Amino acid sequence: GLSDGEWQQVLNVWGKVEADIAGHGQEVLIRLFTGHPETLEKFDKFKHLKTEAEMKASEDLKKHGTVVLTALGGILKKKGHHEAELKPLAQSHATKHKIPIKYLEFISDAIIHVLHSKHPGDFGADAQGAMTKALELFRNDIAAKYKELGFQ
């Protein structure tokens, strides 16, 4: 798990995301979709987006970005004690959305990328290290639920 100091850094970094949840959310999704087009196909409601320009102009994509980061934020504020918040997401993504664990790796990397892009020089080594551990914990706990379901 993460140390108390690491959790503090994670939640301090998250303060940046909360200042503009819609903006960070949009950029994370766009980064995910542009870098890994196979992910866009998992969204029937976003498959119509053929260009990044259309993605950037999609108010529904911004809307979903807000739903996604709000969920993650709630989970992060639990500092590891997130079984109740995490189990339902793990099961909805495996059974309903059919999202390979690899895609969660993609979005984790996208979050780190977006943080550096929006806060260059203000996302230090210790901060990236802590946020990375938090995302891996998130990812690993979802992976455990995936194995339970036998989903690949």
Ligand code: HEM
């Ligand atoms: C930071 C990790 C993620 C979080 C916190 C997250 C969160 C959410 C939330 C809260 C919902 C709506 C409720 C639900 O259906 O469970 C949702 C829906 C969905 N998510 Fe994720 N998600 C994550 C990663 C992914 C990834 C990597 C994909 C891959 C493409 C994905 C695909 C979907 C799809 C297809 C839907 C349904 C959208 C709709 O039709 O309205 N999610 N997600």
